[PDB]
Amino acid sequence: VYKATRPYLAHCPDCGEGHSCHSPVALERIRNEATDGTLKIQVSLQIGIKTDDSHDWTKLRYMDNHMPADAERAGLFVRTSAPCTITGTMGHFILARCPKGETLTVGFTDSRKISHSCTHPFHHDPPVIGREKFHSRPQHGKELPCSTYVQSTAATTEEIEVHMPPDTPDRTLMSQQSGNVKITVNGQTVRYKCNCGGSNEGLTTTDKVINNCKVDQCHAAVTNHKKWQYNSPLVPRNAELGDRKGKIHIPFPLANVTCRVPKARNPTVTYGKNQVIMLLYPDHPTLLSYRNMGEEPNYQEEWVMHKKEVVLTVPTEGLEVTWGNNEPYKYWPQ
Amino acid sequence: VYKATRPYLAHCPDCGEGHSCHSPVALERIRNEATDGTLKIQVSLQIGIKTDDSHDWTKLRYMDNHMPADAERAGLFVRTSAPCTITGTMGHFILARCPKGETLTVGFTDSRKISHSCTHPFHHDPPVIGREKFHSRPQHGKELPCSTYVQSTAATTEEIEVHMPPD
Amino acid sequence: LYPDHPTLLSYRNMGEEPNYQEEWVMHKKEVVLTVPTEGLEVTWGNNEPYKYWPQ
Amino acid sequence: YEHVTVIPNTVGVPYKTLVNRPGYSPMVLEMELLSVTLEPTLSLDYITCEYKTVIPSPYVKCCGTAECKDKNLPDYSCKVFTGVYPFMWGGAYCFCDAENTQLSEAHVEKSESCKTEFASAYRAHTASASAKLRVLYQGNNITVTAYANGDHAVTVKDAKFIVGPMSSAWTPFDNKIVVYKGDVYNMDYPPFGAGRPGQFGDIQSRTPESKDVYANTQLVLQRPAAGTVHVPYSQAPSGFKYWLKERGASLQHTAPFGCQIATNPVRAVNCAVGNMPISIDIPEAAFTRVVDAPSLTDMSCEVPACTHSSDFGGVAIIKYAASKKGKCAVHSMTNAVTIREAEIEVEGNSQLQISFSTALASAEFRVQVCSTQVHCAAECHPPKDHIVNYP
Amino acid sequence: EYKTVIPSPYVKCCGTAECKDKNLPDYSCKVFTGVYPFMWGGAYCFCDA
Amino acid sequence: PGQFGDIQSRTPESKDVYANTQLVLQRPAAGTVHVPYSQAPSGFKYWLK
Amino acid sequence: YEHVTVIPNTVGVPYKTLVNRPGYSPMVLEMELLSVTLEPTLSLDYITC
């Protein structure tokens, strides 16, 4: 599919030091639907693909001015408040495990050893999987349902919209021929528009002159009607063609998997006439729930934070008490 | 004016690892009156000046024991909780855009490749300009009144007191 | 009032006794204001002031 | 002919006034508050801004005792520390082991920001009232700017205007005011030499050029660290920086009667409070005699559309029989109904269309076109809603 | 969980674009006048205004 | 918006969906090609907690 | 302006309703029932043949 598509330059609000630029690593969209905390990041460049369209995991292709160029995969980095762990890369997509942050930065080092980066405001603080806030993933534990972006390079379910790009504006193409406009193509296909009469519009392959016209009244751009590009809101739509679009499958789709797991415990107490007394000693917030085993259950619940004595009425029908992850306790009067 | 003035060694409470020293990059004063968040930092060394008093933006002069010595401008760094963006340097002054922090560090690398730094406790959390807490500066938007330290190398209004040193 | 962020609500009577009042509206809040004969001026955040008069 | 009327002191509301000179065709004048300025006389007490702590090199007297002298400087602090033995890079600064003293010296001054970022404390007294406004006079809009004291006569197109005196002498300004850029605040500011630490006036400068300043910020000099040359000290944050966040809403937002507040000079514009008498000495040439004006008969009125609201929600079609061609004044003879049109051109046996405003659901009103009255019956429907957003 | 479909904006150089009512959920369309956008190699439009 | 049902799909295969979330398009930055916008958080994510 | 009326639940009968907004010319609206569907929730017990 990469024979038809290409990396591109798009708007980035922060290319370093808070200044905006036409970035070759522009951030398109950050996806965080995976409960395991994995981020699916979309950028303007293409990883694992060379300029000749061949697949090479050690390489990366980015738009260098007018033509795409090759760069090293090792130079690619993802960071929030600190560096991220990159779990997978293919085309416009990056999979990363990031620490807590308020921004997201994706960058690389080009052929000329020049670093390029794009920073977007993104609140990253992934929710806890289960009931324990841990750092490293265990080999053994409680199996809990979670979602992730699969590390499989295969593109079969998820998709993106693609269309023909865009023309690269270049004011150096135009020059003041005494008191007229001289458009020099230099062996390229140039799209030009002048705020003058006559042949003020055209897709030229040869040099053109616009008499009685000023250089400021004209617009010139180098084109390439040959090449699909992601339907980016950071790049303008092709003016000639209407709502013409294609679609391509993307790597790393979101899928339901299993995430390690954990457990819990329980306690005991003291008795009275149609009454149960429990001395709760929680080591962390523990949910206490209870119900009558008759016609009127009267379900009640409370999160127990610390040392609390609970006095519960045990009716003739019986009382069922659930203390955290423990199996429910059942009580009946004598 | 740099023909009459010189870089110097002065007390710094933290030259690295919490130990005090006679620093060639000692922090004098940190100014934060600019509502745009720009910090005007004053140090004991002189940036953009060589030992022969000539102006060179790629160079820096610091007091090396008894005599001043030349160092690279590229080796100069400013950091709070993370590295700062240096916006301007001239003589004893540095302009920097810093992230939120509780300390301020200014350092450099000397001729002998030895790093020198000075850390002072400084609460940096600049207030919001307007009614929106944003990260990067926009090209277009609402024009609001704010103050900054102008990046102009020219010295015409603000001043400092000077006198003969020391043994 | 449906604010997306803290929004300053201010109001005054357009007569001899303006009785200026202000409050920072954090979330969903219904505000009941008295409109006197002289008129009432209401400013909701950065919007231009709204003016109300009885029929 | 002197026409005298009274309009409420409310800006942006066009008012219609009927001028009836005996033996002359009625004249309708539309008046809309131009501007009414209340500029108080200001006397600068002092300016305040962010403060800056001047600490020179400490006087380390080797083998001797330094002496502190009383210096007339704001928050002047001096302390002589005995038993000091300071070190420099190449060893001890003093020849003596004992009997060395360090004189620590400090004072407080205006920051470099004081020329750009500052608040001015003024004594405001006896405001001078000034006026102008918009008058639809002879099919053209004329602007009259006059002091609302009932004395300042302003003549525009031979028509002499006397505005005021204002029914309310209310200001929105108190005896003591504070000005910061384009914002004015009513504040009983501390007098010069009475400023509190961490509060408005912690630093006080009589003028922004003043060399000497008053300062009350808790500057205390501390004993330097063993073998260390430095001036340690303990010191309340900027009162001006504190006031900038604690000032609250300015007079432009809090003032009654819909007052607009401007600076350079400090003034109250278009006060929302009381009423304003208007005197217009209309020249003889502006009037047309009843005989020289068209005579209207066989008048009928129909209201095809009406909505009772703050704006002109009513439409009225008036059929007439005019004796000759000419301009006729249009006016509502009922105070509960107001007409948008002040003057219309008549031809003969033709019809006219007018726009009217009313709050009445059942509006029965009389329309005077030239010197003849016509009854209009209107069934007006509710708008959007009650309360209205126009004056 | 919902997701916001935003295609490439239609930048009509030297002309006025027109919004049409599309039966799509939360459909939003707005035509902005007086634009002069730039790409890497200069201005995208030939016209100044 | 921001509540259970902010987005509604008759069946999980359904192409057309109902949406009531506060999507407002903003004027792009000077000389910049982008689609800025203001938009209530996921009602389903809110219901889950 | 909210116009409220009640028509019998009978299909194929055109009904005329007079909309009288005060201060506005009367408006006559013809209404005819298009469809009213009552779809019960089904739970299959078994099939027979």
Side-chain angles (χ1 to χ4, degrees), chain D residues 304-307 379 381-382, chain G residues 1 20-25:
Chain D
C306 195
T307 293
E379 183 188 50
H381 308 288
Chain G
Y1 172 81
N20 186 76
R21 191 185 177 194
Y24 295 85
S25 191

PDB file of all heavy atoms in Angstrom, chain D residues 304-307 379 381-382, chain G residues 1 20-25:
ATOM      1  N   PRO D 304     -51.784  45.146  10.238  1.00  0.00           N
ATOM      2  CA  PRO D 304     -51.749  43.767   9.723  1.00  0.00           C
ATOM      3  C   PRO D 304     -50.841  42.826  10.513  1.00  0.00           C
ATOM      4  O   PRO D 304     -51.022  41.611  10.423  1.00  0.00           O
ATOM      5  CB  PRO D 304     -51.269  43.942   8.283  1.00  0.00           C
ATOM      6  CG  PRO D 304     -50.411  45.154   8.326  1.00  0.00           C
ATOM      7  CD  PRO D 304     -50.983  46.056   9.388  1.00  0.00           C
ATOM      8  N   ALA D 305     -49.859  43.371  11.264  1.00  0.00           N
ATOM      9  CA  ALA D 305     -48.906  42.589  12.053  1.00  0.00           C
ATOM     10  C   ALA D 305     -48.467  43.301  13.329  1.00  0.00           C
ATOM     11  O   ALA D 305     -48.059  44.467  13.272  1.00  0.00           O
ATOM     12  CB  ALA D 305     -47.683  42.248  11.209  1.00  0.00           C
ATOM     13  N   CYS D 306     -48.540  42.599  14.479  1.00  0.00           N
ATOM     14  CA  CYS D 306     -48.087  43.121  15.769  1.00  0.00           C
ATOM     15  C   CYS D 306     -47.598  42.075  16.751  1.00  0.00           C
ATOM     16  O   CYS D 306     -48.259  41.060  16.984  1.00  0.00           O
ATOM     17  CB  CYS D 306     -49.083  44.075  16.425  1.00  0.00           C
ATOM     18  SG  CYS D 306     -48.369  45.048  17.779  1.00  0.00           S
ATOM     19  N   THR D 307     -46.446  42.370  17.358  1.00  0.00           N
ATOM     20  CA  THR D 307     -45.791  41.592  18.397  1.00  0.00           C
ATOM     21  C   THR D 307     -45.382  42.591  19.482  1.00  0.00           C
ATOM     22  O   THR D 307     -44.625  43.526  19.196  1.00  0.00           O
ATOM     23  CB  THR D 307     -44.622  40.776  17.811  1.00  0.00           C
ATOM     24  OG1 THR D 307     -45.152  39.784  16.931  1.00  0.00           O
ATOM     25  CG2 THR D 307     -43.775  40.098  18.884  1.00  0.00           C
ATOM     26  N   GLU D 379     -54.006  44.195  17.866  1.00  0.00           N
ATOM     27  CA  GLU D 379     -53.980  42.975  18.666  1.00  0.00           C
ATOM     28  C   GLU D 379     -52.538  42.491  18.568  1.00  0.00           C
ATOM     29  O   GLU D 379     -52.130  41.965  17.531  1.00  0.00           O
ATOM     30  CB  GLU D 379     -54.966  41.921  18.127  1.00  0.00           C
ATOM     31  CG  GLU D 379     -55.011  40.658  18.976  1.00  0.00           C
ATOM     32  CD  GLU D 379     -55.818  39.496  18.431  1.00  0.00           C
ATOM     33  OE1 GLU D 379     -55.620  39.125  17.249  1.00  0.00           O
ATOM     34  OE2 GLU D 379     -56.622  38.930  19.202  1.00  0.00           O
ATOM     35  N   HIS D 381     -49.258  40.215  19.750  1.00  0.00           N
ATOM     36  CA  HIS D 381     -48.936  38.869  20.218  1.00  0.00           C
ATOM     37  C   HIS D 381     -47.621  38.785  21.015  1.00  0.00           C
ATOM     38  O   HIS D 381     -46.763  39.653  20.844  1.00  0.00           O
ATOM     39  CB  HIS D 381     -48.947  37.896  19.025  1.00  0.00           C
ATOM     40  CG  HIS D 381     -50.205  37.968  18.214  1.00  0.00           C
ATOM     41  ND1 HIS D 381     -51.401  37.467  18.690  1.00  0.00           N
ATOM     42  CD2 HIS D 381     -50.416  38.518  16.994  1.00  0.00           C
ATOM     43  CE1 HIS D 381     -52.293  37.704  17.744  1.00  0.00           C
ATOM     44  NE2 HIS D 381     -51.747  38.330  16.703  1.00  0.00           N
ATOM     45  N   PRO D 382     -47.433  37.770  21.900  1.00  0.00           N
ATOM     46  CA  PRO D 382     -46.181  37.699  22.681  1.00  0.00           C
ATOM     47  C   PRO D 382     -44.937  37.366  21.848  1.00  0.00           C
ATOM     48  O   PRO D 382     -45.057  36.645  20.853  1.00  0.00           O
ATOM     49  CB  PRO D 382     -46.466  36.611  23.727  1.00  0.00           C
ATOM     50  CG  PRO D 382     -47.942  36.367  23.670  1.00  0.00           C
ATOM     51  CD  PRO D 382     -48.338  36.662  22.266  1.00  0.00           C
TER      52      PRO D 382
ATOM     53  N   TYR G   1     -43.249  29.755  17.395  1.00  0.00           N
ATOM     54  CA  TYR G   1     -44.554  29.687  18.051  1.00  0.00           C
ATOM     55  C   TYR G   1     -45.006  28.230  18.117  1.00  0.00           C
ATOM     56  O   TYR G   1     -45.088  27.565  17.080  1.00  0.00           O
ATOM     57  CB  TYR G   1     -45.584  30.555  17.296  1.00  0.00           C
ATOM     58  CG  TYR G   1     -47.010  30.413  17.786  1.00  0.00           C
ATOM     59  CD1 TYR G   1     -47.455  31.106  18.910  1.00  0.00           C
ATOM     60  CD2 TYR G   1     -47.920  29.596  17.121  1.00  0.00           C
ATOM     61  CE1 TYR G   1     -48.769  30.982  19.363  1.00  0.00           C
ATOM     62  CE2 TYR G   1     -49.233  29.461  17.568  1.00  0.00           C
ATOM     63  CZ  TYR G   1     -49.656  30.159  18.688  1.00  0.00           C
ATOM     64  OH  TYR G   1     -50.950  30.035  19.128  1.00  0.00           O
ATOM     65  N   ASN G  20     -53.060  30.424  14.884  1.00  0.00           N
ATOM     66  CA  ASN G  20     -53.281  31.847  15.084  1.00  0.00           C
ATOM     67  C   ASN G  20     -52.280  32.443  16.070  1.00  0.00           C
ATOM     68  O   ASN G  20     -52.516  32.444  17.282  1.00  0.00           O
ATOM     69  CB  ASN G  20     -54.728  32.144  15.477  1.00  0.00           C
ATOM     70  CG  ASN G  20     -55.039  33.615  15.557  1.00  0.00           C
ATOM     71  OD1 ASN G  20     -55.203  34.300  14.541  1.00  0.00           O
ATOM     72  ND2 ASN G  20     -55.101  34.141  16.770  1.00  0.00           N
ATOM     73  N   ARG G  21     -51.153  32.926  15.534  1.00  0.00           N
ATOM     74  CA  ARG G  21     -50.105  33.592  16.300  1.00  0.00           C
ATOM     75  C   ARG G  21     -50.532  35.065  16.410  1.00  0.00           C
ATOM     76  O   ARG G  21     -50.773  35.692  15.370  1.00  0.00           O
ATOM     77  CB  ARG G  21     -48.747  33.453  15.586  1.00  0.00           C
ATOM     78  CG  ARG G  21     -47.552  33.871  16.426  1.00  0.00           C
ATOM     79  CD  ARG G  21     -46.269  33.814  15.624  1.00  0.00           C
ATOM     80  NE  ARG G  21     -45.122  34.274  16.407  1.00  0.00           N
ATOM     81  CZ  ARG G  21     -43.936  34.576  15.891  1.00  0.00           C
ATOM     82  NH1 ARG G  21     -43.724  34.476  14.584  1.00  0.00           N
ATOM     83  NH2 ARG G  21     -42.949  34.984  16.677  1.00  0.00           N
ATOM     84  N   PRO G  22     -50.693  35.623  17.640  1.00  0.00           N
ATOM     85  CA  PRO G  22     -51.146  37.023  17.768  1.00  0.00           C
ATOM     86  C   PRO G  22     -50.266  38.033  17.033  1.00  0.00           C
ATOM     87  O   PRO G  22     -49.045  38.015  17.185  1.00  0.00           O
ATOM     88  CB  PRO G  22     -51.163  37.260  19.281  1.00  0.00           C
ATOM     89  CG  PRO G  22     -51.269  35.900  19.881  1.00  0.00           C
ATOM     90  CD  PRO G  22     -50.485  35.006  18.967  1.00  0.00           C
ATOM     91  N   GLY G  23     -50.907  38.863  16.205  1.00  0.00           N
ATOM     92  CA  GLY G  23     -50.254  39.881  15.389  1.00  0.00           C
ATOM     93  C   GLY G  23     -49.723  39.370  14.063  1.00  0.00           C
ATOM     94  O   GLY G  23     -49.067  40.112  13.324  1.00  0.00           O
ATOM     95  N   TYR G  24     -49.997  38.091  13.751  1.00  0.00           N
ATOM     96  CA  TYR G  24     -49.557  37.431  12.521  1.00  0.00           C
ATOM     97  C   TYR G  24     -50.750  36.828  11.807  1.00  0.00           C
ATOM     98  O   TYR G  24     -51.664  36.324  12.462  1.00  0.00           O
ATOM     99  CB  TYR G  24     -48.491  36.362  12.827  1.00  0.00           C
ATOM    100  CG  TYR G  24     -47.198  36.934  13.373  1.00  0.00           C
ATOM    101  CD1 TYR G  24     -47.046  37.195  14.733  1.00  0.00           C
ATOM    102  CD2 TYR G  24     -46.128  37.217  12.532  1.00  0.00           C
ATOM    103  CE1 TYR G  24     -45.866  37.737  15.236  1.00  0.00           C
ATOM    104  CE2 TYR G  24     -44.937  37.744  13.028  1.00  0.00           C
ATOM    105  CZ  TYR G  24     -44.811  38.007  14.382  1.00  0.00           C
ATOM    106  OH  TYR G  24     -43.643  38.531  14.879  1.00  0.00           O
ATOM    107  N   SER G  25     -50.747  36.899  10.462  1.00  0.00           N
ATOM    108  CA  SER G  25     -51.813  36.373   9.603  1.00  0.00           C
ATOM    109  C   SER G  25     -52.083  34.888   9.885  1.00  0.00           C
ATOM    110  O   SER G  25     -51.123  34.129  10.067  1.00  0.00           O
ATOM    111  CB  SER G  25     -51.462  36.568   8.130  1.00  0.00           C
ATOM    112  OG  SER G  25     -52.565  36.294   7.283  1.00  0.00           O
TER     113      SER G  25
END
